[PDB]
Write a protein that binds this ligand. Structure first.
Ligand code: EYF
Ligand code: CO
Ligand code: CO
Ligand code: MG
Ligand code: NA
Length: 304
């Protein structure tokens, strides 16, 4: 395998971390290949759940707890900290909140969060590599509580970064917030990628095509499929009571991705950097609510 950039996997991985049996588990947690029978059944259906008041309470809760976990991770980002150390802290934080860390054994993913450095687009595997000054790193959190999944991510700066890194991360966060600003009943899911690509292109960046936003609730990934690029052919119209993610991945060079031999880590084919942000959204009569919002701070972590 020809690595596309400087980054390499740093093995061995610490042994798999267990989740106490007192924590409720999603179906895939105990499937040998990590398959979700509940997802595979609804595969091919493009209808979107209208959440009950009860489902909404369940999503507010898990999304609040997932934000608390991301904030734990954010406090650890500096040179010399390994991504495995971040994951271990995340895993304990989930357990402390009576939550299962959704990524763990999702299609056999080996860790409890995804940590994506520099040319990693998404799904990076926490490992023994110490973070270096100048790195950008995304931590992607998803929790499972009382039957509901809540999903968010942010990109962080590792010490001082270059102007390029600042512009990439800022634009990506802007792409996400412009998409969010367009969400309200009667907007087509396919329109969000028009707004995202328009802002990325204006700043000289490209938009990943291979990975999309998703419906989330009782399933980790379900309808709708939410592409981040322009002139996609997503099916569906937003209605009050729909929950889904927007999670744009923006690249310094081309949009093309490829996967490492580990089967998970997605990287730019050109080796240039990629950044990502994600929120879980509830569509309301007036617009949308950001379920994974910060409660105690106006801005994302990179802004400080
Ligand atoms: C075999 O196919 C693959 C390849 C890579 C990853 C995985 C599975 N998986 C693990 C966790 C995980 C997190 C997200 C997420 O939505 N963040 O917003 C998505 N997929 C995920 C499967
Ligand atoms: Co996520
Ligand atoms: Co997601
Ligand atoms: Mg090394
Ligand atoms: Na990256």
């Amino acid at each position: 395998y020809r690595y596309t950039g400087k980054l390499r996997p740093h093995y061995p991985l610490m042994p798999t971390r267990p989740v106490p049996s007192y924590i409720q588990r999603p179906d895939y947690a105990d499937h040998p290949l990590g398959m979700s029978e509940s997802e595979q059944a609804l595969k091919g259906t493009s209808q979107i759940k209208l959440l009950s008041s009860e489902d909404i309470e369940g999503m507010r809760l898990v999304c609040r707890l997932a934000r608390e976990v991301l904030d734990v991770a954010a406090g650890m980002i500096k040179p010399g900290v390994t991504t495995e150390e971040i994951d271990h802290a995340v895993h304990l934080a989930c357990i402390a909140r009576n939550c299962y860390p959704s990524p763990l054994n999702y299609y056999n993913f080996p860790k409890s969060c995804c940590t994506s450095v520099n040319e990693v687009i998404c799904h990076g595997i926490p490992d023994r590599r110490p973070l270096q000054e100048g790195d950008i790193v995304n931590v992607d959190i998803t929790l499972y509580r009382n039957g509901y999944h809540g999903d968010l991510n942010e990109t962080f700066f590792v010490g001082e970064v270059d102007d390029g890194a600042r512009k990439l991360v800022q634009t990506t966060y802007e792409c996400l917030m412009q998409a969010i600003d367009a969400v309200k009943p009667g907007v087509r899911y396919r329109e969000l990628g028009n707004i995202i690509q328009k802002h990325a292109q204006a700043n000289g960046f490209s938009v990943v095509r291979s990975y999309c936003g998703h419906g989330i609730h009782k399933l980790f990934h379900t309808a709708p499929n939410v592409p981040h690029y322009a002139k996609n052919k997503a099916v569906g119209v937003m209605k009050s009571g729909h929950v889904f993610t927007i999670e744009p991945m923006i690249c310094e060079g081309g949009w093309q991705d490829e996967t490492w031999p580990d089967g998970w880590t997605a990287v730019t084919r050109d080796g240039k950097r990629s950044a990502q942000f994600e929120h879980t959204l509830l569509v309301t009569d007036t617009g949308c609510e950001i379920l994974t919002r910060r409660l105690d701070s106006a801005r994302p972590h990179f802004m400080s």
